[PDB]
Structure 1
Amino acid sequence: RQSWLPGSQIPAHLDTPAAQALAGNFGFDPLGLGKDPVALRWYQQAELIHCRTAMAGVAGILIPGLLTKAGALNVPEWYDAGKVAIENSFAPWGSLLAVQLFLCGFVEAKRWQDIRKPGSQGEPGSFLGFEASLKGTSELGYPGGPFDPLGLSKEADKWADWKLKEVKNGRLAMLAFLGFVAQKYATGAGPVDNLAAHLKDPWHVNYATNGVSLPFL
């Protein structure tokens, strides 16, 4: 098997049939958090949700960020998108935050009750009729039905590969967003401009020169 550190002793809780059947297992647990299988279950759920929302957010940063260097899509910088949006908008930000709290709390409550009980949300008479297709698909965190419309999740031969691509791209996306934050506080411009200013002069413009990222040198 692959390991993060070849030659390192892989911990015994990440070496089970239950833990090796997880997407993107690389035996990485230096701080031994996942000693409890229930806790490992919950943490896997946390990783999946963070992956999906991280991909969505970072794509939202990049793709308008890239395409604005072309002609179309005049988009302001991601750290200024809220202001301009709310000046474009019709309501104050408080009411928008309240509405999103409601509409997201409902859904997250659903998903949470499905985490505590696996076959929960599908029981007769609960919803007006989507109770038909709100069960799980035998692997928690990966529902079916109205999710996965295109039927890509039906074939069994591509299954682990779709999983593994998801988790790898997601981990990379989380790293990307943390990078967005740090580059915002460090240099003071958009990430696309950081990429351009680094490709323009690599040996002079990096975090060894920005004067904040390591002040002792």
Structure 2
Amino acid sequence: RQSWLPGSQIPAHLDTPAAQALAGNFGFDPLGLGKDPVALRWYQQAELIHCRTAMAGVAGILIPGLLTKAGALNVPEWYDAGKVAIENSFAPWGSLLAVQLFLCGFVEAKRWQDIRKPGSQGEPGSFLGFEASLKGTSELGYPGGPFDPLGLSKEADKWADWKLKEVKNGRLAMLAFLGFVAQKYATGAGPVDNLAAHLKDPWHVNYATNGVSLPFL
């Protein structure tokens, strides 16, 4: 099948109905961290959450960051917007972080009780109307009802493609974010600016000439 490394052998664990049926599989675990299936499923869930959050974050960075080059939507840099917004704020950052911590912990508790026992949150009466749609969609990591509100799941011929493009774009988002932070350390300027620099000159605007990435030269 499609393997990250042609010629290579498939990891023992990575070739099973579940693995080949999970997503985005190319026999890539040279550290064999998935020789255990429970750990493997747990890590699939972790990777899902990471893909989603990284996609969200990289959008929130690029889009306003790109349009600040445009006239409107003049926005400060992302690694400084913290200072900017806390200046323009109305509440102390302590209380802000505390409340957002509470409200994230609640939802995380729900997700976690589910991943512990899938049919956990359909317990009748535990809420007033939640349990109705508060039940898994037979695939741990794809809640239903309001989640997937536009009925994109009632068309299975697009189901696999949705899953695949989700995981692909998520992995790309994680990678782009790491590039962001790395270049903000090395150069320190706007990502769009590093972009424009390497475009105005590829052959000399690069880590190869940053004098830092490769210090021995």
5+ unaligned residues in a row in structure 1: which ranges? Answer: none
Offset from partner CA, 1:123-176 (integer Å, 9 cap, x none): 101112111111110010011111011111110101111000000000000001
Q: Secondary structure at the match of 2:143?
A: coil
Name which structure has the greater RCO, CA cutoff 8 Å, separation 6+: 1
Q: Secondary structure at the match of 1:31?
A: coil
Q: Secondary structure at the match of 1:144?
A: coil
Q: What is the CA–CA distance in structure 1 between the aligned matches of 2:75 and 2:25, rounded to whole Å?
A: 38
Q: Name the TM-score, length of structure 1 as normaliser.
A: 0.98
Q: What is the CA–CA distance in structure 1 between the aligned matches of 2:164 and 2:66, rounded to whole Å?
A: 27
Q: What is the CA–CA distance in structure 2 between the aligned matches of 1:17 and 1:42, rounded to whole Å?
A: 16
Q: What is the CA–CA distance in structure 2 between the aligned matches of 1:12 and 1:120, rounded to whole Å?
A: 33
Q: What is the CA–CA distance in structure 2 between the aligned matches of 1:53 and 1:139, rounded to whole Å?
A: 19
Q: What is the CA–CA distance in structure 2 between the aligned matches of 1:109 and 1:212, rounded to whole Å?
A: 43
Q: Secondary structure at the match of 2:213?
A: coil
Q: What is the CA–CA distance in structure 2 between the aligned matches of 1:190 and 1:123, rounded to whole Å?
A: 50
Q: Secondary structure at the match of 2:157?
A: coil
Offset from partner CA, 1:20-68 (integer Å, 9 cap, x none): 1111111110111011100001000000000000000000010001111
Q: Count residues with an aligned counterpart.
A: 217
- 1:95 is displaced (CA, Å) by 0.6
Q: Name the TM-score, length of structure 2 as normaliser.
A: 0.98
Q: What is the CA–CA distance in structure 1 between the aligned matches of 2:87 and 2:153, rounded to whole Å?
A: 42
Q: What is the CA–CA distance in structure 2 between the aligned matches of 1:93 and 1:210, rounded to whole Å?
A: 36
- C-alpha RMSD of the superposition: 0.7
Q: What is the CA–CA distance in structure 2 between the aligned matches of 1:190 and 1:31, rounded to whole Å?
A: 35
Is 1:81 matched up with 2:74?
no
Q: What is the CA–CA distance in structure 2 between the aligned matches of 1:154 and 1:99, rounded to whole Å?
A: 37
Task: Identify which range, 43-52 or 145-154, moves more after superposition.
Answer: 145-154
Q: What is the CA–CA distance in structure 2 between the aligned matches of 1:211 and 1:91, rounded to whole Å?
A: 43
Q: What is the CA–CA distance in structure 1 between the aligned matches of 2:127 and 2:211, rounded to whole Å?
A: 57
Q: What is the CA–CA distance in structure 1 between the aligned matches of 2:116 and 2:165, rounded to whole Å?
A: 27
